[PDB]
Scaffold this motif. Structure first.
Motif, PDB file in Angstrom:
ATOM      1  N   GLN A 130     -27.555 -16.269  -2.889  1.00 24.64           N
ATOM      2  CA  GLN A 130     -28.907 -16.797  -3.029  1.00 24.64           C
ATOM      3  C   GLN A 130     -28.988 -18.240  -2.558  1.00 24.64           C
ATOM      4  OE1 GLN A 130     -31.916 -15.948  -3.702  1.00 24.64           O
ATOM      5  NE2 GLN A 130     -31.775 -13.829  -4.429  1.00 24.64           N
ATOM      6  N   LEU A 131     -27.850 -18.929  -2.496  1.00 27.43           N
ATOM      7  CA  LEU A 131     -27.787 -20.260  -1.914  1.00 27.43           C
ATOM      8  C   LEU A 131     -27.347 -20.239  -0.456  1.00 27.43           C
ATOM      9  CD1 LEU A 131     -28.555 -22.948  -2.394  1.00 27.43           C
ATOM     10  CD2 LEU A 131     -26.808 -23.199  -4.149  1.00 27.43           C
ATOM     11  N   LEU A 132     -26.794 -19.125   0.018  1.00 23.43           N
ATOM     12  CA  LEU A 132     -26.367 -19.030   1.408  1.00 23.43           C
ATOM     13  C   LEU A 132     -27.577 -19.022   2.333  1.00 23.43           C
ATOM     14  CD1 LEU A 132     -24.051 -18.765   3.386  1.00 23.43           C
ATOM     15  CD2 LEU A 132     -24.044 -16.300   3.011  1.00 23.43           C
ATOM     16  N   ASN A 133     -27.421 -19.652   3.494  1.00 22.72           N
ATOM     17  CA  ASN A 133     -28.480 -19.772   4.480  1.00 22.72           C
ATOM     18  C   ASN A 133     -27.966 -19.341   5.847  1.00 22.72           C
ATOM     19  OD1 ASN A 133     -27.311 -21.879   3.001  1.00 22.72           O
ATOM     20  ND2 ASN A 133     -29.166 -23.138   3.093  1.00 22.72           N
ATOM     21  N   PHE A 134     -28.897 -18.948   6.720  1.00 22.96           N
ATOM     22  CA  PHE A 134     -28.522 -18.602   8.087  1.00 22.96           C
ATOM     23  C   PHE A 134     -27.903 -19.798   8.794  1.00 22.96           C
ATOM     24  CE2 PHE A 134     -32.344 -16.180   6.926  1.00 22.96           C
ATOM     25  CZ  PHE A 134     -31.824 -14.903   6.956  1.00 22.96           C
ATOM     26  N   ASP A 135     -28.532 -20.964   8.661  1.00 23.47           N
ATOM     27  CA  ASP A 135     -28.018 -22.174   9.286  1.00 23.47           C
ATOM     28  C   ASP A 135     -26.741 -22.668   8.616  1.00 23.47           C
ATOM     29  OD1 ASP A 135     -30.173 -22.071   7.502  1.00 23.47           O
ATOM     30  OD2 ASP A 135     -30.457 -24.244   7.576  1.00 23.47           O
ATOM     31  N   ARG A 136     -26.671 -22.616   7.288  1.00 27.64           N
ATOM     32  CA  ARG A 136     -25.499 -23.066   6.544  1.00 27.64           C
ATOM     33  C   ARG A 136     -24.558 -21.884   6.363  1.00 27.64           C
ATOM     34  NH1 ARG A 136     -22.920 -25.099   5.552  1.00 27.64           N
ATOM     35  NH2 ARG A 136     -22.540 -26.225   3.589  1.00 27.64           N
ATOM     36  N   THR A 137     -23.534 -21.805   7.212  1.00 28.04           N
ATOM     37  CA  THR A 137     -22.534 -20.756   7.079  1.00 28.04           C
ATOM     38  C   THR A 137     -21.683 -20.922   5.829  1.00 28.04           C
ATOM     39  OG1 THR A 137     -20.741 -19.608   8.239  1.00 28.04           O
ATOM     40  CG2 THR A 137     -20.831 -22.014   8.420  1.00 28.04           C
ATOM     41  N   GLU A 138     -21.730 -22.085   5.192  1.00 19.33           N
ATOM     42  CA  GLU A 138     -21.099 -22.324   3.905  1.00 19.33           C
ATOM     43  C   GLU A 138     -22.140 -22.226   2.797  1.00 19.33           C
ATOM     44  OE1 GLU A 138     -18.779 -25.769   3.439  1.00 19.33           O
ATOM     45  OE2 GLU A 138     -17.315 -25.259   4.996  1.00 19.33           O
ATOM     46  N   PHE A 139     -21.685 -22.454   1.572  1.00 20.87           N
ATOM     47  CA  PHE A 139     -22.545 -22.425   0.398  1.00 20.87           C
ATOM     48  C   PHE A 139     -22.850 -23.857  -0.023  1.00 20.87           C
ATOM     49  CE2 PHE A 139     -19.729 -18.577  -0.301  1.00 20.87           C
ATOM     50  CZ  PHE A 139     -20.577 -17.743   0.397  1.00 20.87           C
ATOM     51  N   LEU A 140     -24.130 -24.211  -0.028  1.00 19.67           N
ATOM     52  CA  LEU A 140     -24.541 -25.529  -0.478  1.00 19.67           C
ATOM     53  C   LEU A 140     -24.599 -25.572  -2.002  1.00 19.67           C
ATOM     54  CD1 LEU A 140     -27.202 -26.966   1.973  1.00 19.67           C
ATOM     55  CD2 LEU A 140     -24.868 -27.730   1.496  1.00 19.67           C
ATOM     56  N   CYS A 141     -24.826 -26.767  -2.535  1.00 18.72           N
ATOM     57  CA  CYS A 141     -25.064 -26.973  -3.960  1.00 18.72           C
ATOM     58  C   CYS A 141     -26.366 -27.750  -4.088  1.00 18.72           C
ATOM     59  CB  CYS A 141     -23.910 -27.719  -4.615  1.00 18.72           C
ATOM     60  SG  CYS A 141     -24.258 -28.193  -6.312  1.00 18.72           S
ATOM     61  N   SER A 142     -27.460 -27.037  -4.365  1.00 19.75           N
ATOM     62  CA  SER A 142     -28.777 -27.668  -4.361  1.00 19.75           C
ATOM     63  C   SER A 142     -28.874 -28.806  -5.368  1.00 19.75           C
ATOM     64  CB  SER A 142     -29.857 -26.622  -4.637  1.00 19.75           C
ATOM     65  OG  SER A 142     -29.856 -25.621  -3.636  1.00 19.75           O
ATOM     66  N   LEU A 143     -28.020 -28.803  -6.395  1.00 19.96           N
ATOM     67  CA  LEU A 143     -28.036 -29.889  -7.370  1.00 19.96           C
ATOM     68  C   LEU A 143     -27.659 -31.217  -6.723  1.00 19.96           C
ATOM     69  CD1 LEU A 143     -27.527 -29.716 -11.001  1.00 19.96           C
ATOM     70  CD2 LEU A 143     -25.966 -31.336  -9.905  1.00 19.96           C
ATOM     71  N   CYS A 144     -26.584 -31.228  -5.937  1.00 18.29           N
ATOM     72  CA  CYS A 144     -26.155 -32.428  -5.234  1.00 18.29           C
ATOM     73  C   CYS A 144     -26.365 -32.344  -3.731  1.00 18.29           C
ATOM     74  CB  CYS A 144     -24.677 -32.712  -5.523  1.00 18.29           C
ATOM     75  SG  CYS A 144     -24.013 -31.871  -6.968  1.00 18.29           S
ATOM     76  N   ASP A 145     -26.879 -31.221  -3.226  1.00 23.04           N
ATOM     77  CA  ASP A 145     -27.014 -30.989  -1.786  1.00 23.04           C
ATOM     78  C   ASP A 145     -25.666 -31.139  -1.082  1.00 23.04           C
ATOM     79  OD1 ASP A 145     -28.518 -30.193   0.406  1.00 23.04           O
ATOM     80  OD2 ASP A 145     -30.142 -31.597  -0.057  1.00 23.04           O
ATOM     81  N   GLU A 146     -24.646 -30.479  -1.623  1.00 22.16           N
ATOM     82  CA  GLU A 146     -23.288 -30.561  -1.114  1.00 22.16           C
ATOM     83  C   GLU A 146     -22.721 -29.166  -0.897  1.00 22.16           C
ATOM     84  OE1 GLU A 146     -21.854 -33.469  -0.494  1.00 22.16           O
ATOM     85  OE2 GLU A 146     -22.999 -34.925  -1.670  1.00 22.16           O
ATOM     86  N   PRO A 147     -21.824 -29.007   0.073  1.00 22.33           N
ATOM     87  CA  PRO A 147     -21.183 -27.703   0.276  1.00 22.33           C
ATOM     88  C   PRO A 147     -20.284 -27.332  -0.891  1.00 22.33           C
ATOM     89  CG  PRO A 147     -20.998 -29.076   2.235  1.00 22.33           C
ATOM     90  CD  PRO A 147     -21.467 -29.967   1.129  1.00 22.33           C
ATOM     91  N   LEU A 148     -20.087 -26.030  -1.062  1.00 24.04           N
ATOM     92  CA  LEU A 148     -19.286 -25.511  -2.159  1.00 24.04           C
ATOM     93  C   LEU A 148     -17.844 -25.269  -1.727  1.00 24.04           C
ATOM     94  CD1 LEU A 148     -21.544 -23.039  -4.149  1.00 24.04           C
ATOM     95  CD2 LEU A 148     -21.117 -25.478  -4.441  1.00 24.04           C
ATOM     96  N   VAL A 149     -16.958 -25.235  -2.720  1.00 23.35           N
ATOM     97  CA  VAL A 149     -15.550 -24.921  -2.523  1.00 23.35           C
ATOM     98  C   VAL A 149     -15.153 -23.853  -3.533  1.00 23.35           C
ATOM     99  CG1 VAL A 149     -15.082 -27.254  -1.687  1.00 23.35           C
ATOM    100  CG2 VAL A 149     -14.663 -26.686  -4.089  1.00 23.35           C
ATOM    101  N   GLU A 150     -14.133 -23.075  -3.181  1.00 17.13           N
ATOM    102  CA  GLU A 150     -13.719 -21.961  -4.018  1.00 17.13           C
ATOM    103  C   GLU A 150     -12.938 -22.451  -5.236  1.00 17.13           C
ATOM    104  OE1 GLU A 150     -12.014 -18.706  -1.984  1.00 17.13           O
ATOM    105  OE2 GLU A 150     -13.328 -18.866  -0.233  1.00 17.13           O
ATOM    106  N   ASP A 151     -12.764 -21.547  -6.198  1.00 17.59           N
ATOM    107  CA  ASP A 151     -12.063 -21.837  -7.440  1.00 17.59           C
ATOM    108  C   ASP A 151     -11.155 -20.663  -7.781  1.00 17.59           C
ATOM    109  OD1 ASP A 151     -11.162 -22.923  -9.796  1.00 17.59           O
ATOM    110  OD2 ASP A 151     -13.008 -22.551 -10.924  1.00 17.59           O
ATOM    111  N   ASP A 152     -10.144 -20.935  -8.610  1.00 18.25           N
ATOM    112  CA  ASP A 152      -9.157 -19.941  -9.039  1.00 18.25           C
ATOM    113  C   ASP A 152      -8.410 -19.359  -7.835  1.00 18.25           C
ATOM    114  OD1 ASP A 152     -10.144 -20.535 -11.504  1.00 18.25           O
ATOM    115  OD2 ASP A 152     -10.817 -18.505 -12.005  1.00 18.25           O
ATOM    116  N   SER A 153      -7.662 -20.244  -7.178  1.00 20.25           N
ATOM    117  CA  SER A 153      -6.858 -19.857  -6.029  1.00 20.25           C
ATOM    118  C   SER A 153      -5.787 -18.844  -6.432  1.00 20.25           C
ATOM    119  CB  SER A 153      -6.204 -21.087  -5.398  1.00 20.25           C
ATOM    120  OG  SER A 153      -7.180 -22.028  -4.989  1.00 20.25           O
ATOM    121  N   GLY A 154      -5.125 -18.281  -5.421  1.00 24.55           N
ATOM    122  CA  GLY A 154      -4.147 -17.230  -5.646  1.00 24.55           C
ATOM    123  C   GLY A 154      -2.890 -17.669  -6.370  1.00 24.55           C
ATOM    124  N   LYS A 155      -2.595 -18.969  -6.390  1.00 24.18           N
ATOM    125  CA  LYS A 155      -1.401 -19.445  -7.083  1.00 24.18           C
ATOM    126  C   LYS A 155      -1.487 -19.182  -8.581  1.00 24.18           C
ATOM    127  CE  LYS A 155      -1.032 -23.234  -3.729  1.00 24.18           C
ATOM    128  NZ  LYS A 155       0.020 -22.569  -2.912  1.00 24.18           N
TER     129      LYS A 155
END
Ligand SMILES: [Zn+2]
Ligand SMILES: [Zn+2]
Lengths: 191, 156
Positions: free
Chosen positions: A135-160
């Motif tokens: 719902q935050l993904l956009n055609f122009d933004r191939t990443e996930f933004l954060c509308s709260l800070c207007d910043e791209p998102l990063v993943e959590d709970d890596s495989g390690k």
């Protein structure tokens, strides 16, 4: 006698997940069926601050419950002696219940870190998820933004971290194996 | 006095602490020159007396420690008074012989951790992090016979 194995098991957990001092009082209580309060006191030759919670832990552990072993005082009084009734049936009730509790808990930790699905904005320090991402993904933004800070998102709970929980599980399975094997050996008779 | 001579000679033998000739024992303190001390040495364990050559000794390993720890099974709890005198720096052996190879009772870190009689299977078992121990404390063992149903609710 299987009841000794129950007491022998009680030493293992009270020395595996507890300290060494947790077994000497456990020894003292199981040394005599009806043991006087002072007799246990003279054995350790230390204060009650290092003895009280040990019996309280054992009574909370339900392995042994201090019973009202009534004694008639010789001075025209009625002062009972604090003799513990070792509650073997409740021992398997309490101790095994925690083992079942921790193993599913560590099972929960396994799939939480199993695959990074939720996202997060380090700028906002808030986690997200895939359903929020789309719902935050956009055609122009191939990443996930954060509308709260207007910043791209990063993943959590890596495989390690999934390995860590599994390594916790492997240690959990190995370190509880003597406890359960001595516990399941009691399951035959339920004494 | 008879007891004062025996007490002084015992302390002097303790002060000497070595097996030497009985003749030198009298001249070390200049008191045990009578047969009373020699008879006391044969009659009391404070001064070691034997038919062999002049020698007075005390009247040593973690293996002996473990056996001595096993020697106090279902008995009273002993102190390391004989362990440290019979084996100097026995507290270090407890640290070296970990994993229940030498259990102890550390009273506090202000009295050299005066230990007691203890035998264990694991003993330390330090690899389980306190986080597992904390969650062990964080999870409180529940109430009465509803719990057999509770573990049945969990599937036990
Ligand atoms: Zn953000
Ligand atoms: Zn209860």
């Amino acid at each position: 006698p299987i009841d000794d194995i129950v007491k022998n098991l009680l030493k293992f957990v009270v020395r595996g997940f507890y300290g060494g001092s947790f077994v000497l009082v456990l020894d003292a209580i199981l040394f005599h069926s009806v043991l006087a309060e002072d007799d246990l006191k003279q054995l350790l030759s230390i204060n009650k601050t290092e003895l009280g919670p040990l019996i309280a832990r054992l009574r909370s552990d339900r392995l042994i419950s201090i019973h009202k072993q009534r004694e008639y005082p010789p001075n025209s009084k009625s002062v009972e002696r604090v003799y513990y009734y070792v509650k073997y049936p409740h021992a398997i009730d309490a101790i095994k219940w925690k083992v079942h509790q921790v193993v599913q808990r560590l099972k929960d930790d396994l799939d939480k870190n199993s695959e990074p699905n939720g996202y997060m904005c380090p700028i906002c320090l808030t986690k997200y998820t895939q359903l929020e991402a789309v719902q935050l993904l956009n055609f122009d933004r191939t990443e996930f933004l954060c509308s709260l800070c207007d910043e791209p998102l990063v993943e959590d709970d890596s495989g390690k971290k999934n390995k860590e929980k599994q390594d916790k599980l492997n240690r959990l399975m190995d370190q509880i194996q003597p406890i359960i094997d001595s516990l399941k050996k009691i399951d035959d008779s339920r004494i | 006095h008879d007891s004062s001579k025996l007490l002084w000679a015992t302390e002097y033998i303790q002060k000497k602490g070595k097996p030497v000739l009985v003749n030198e024992l009298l001249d070390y303190l200049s008191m045990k020159k009578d047969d009373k001390v020699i008879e006391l040495l044969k009659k009391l364990d404070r001064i070691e007396f034997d038919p062999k050559k002049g020698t007075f000794k005390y009247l040593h390993s973690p293996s002996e420690l473990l056996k001595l720890l096993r020697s106090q099974v279902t008995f009273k709890g002993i102190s390391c008074k004989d362990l440290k005198d019979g084996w100097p720096q026995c507290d270090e052996t407890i640290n070296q012989l970990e994993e229940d190879s030498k259990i102890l009772v550390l009273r506090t870190k202000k009295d050299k951790t005066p230990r007691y009689v203890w035998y264990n299977s694991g003993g330390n078992l330090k690899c389980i992090d306190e986080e597992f121990v904390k969650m062990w404390e964080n999870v409180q063992l529940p109430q009465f016979a509803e719990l057999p149903r509770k573990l049945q609710d969990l599937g036990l």
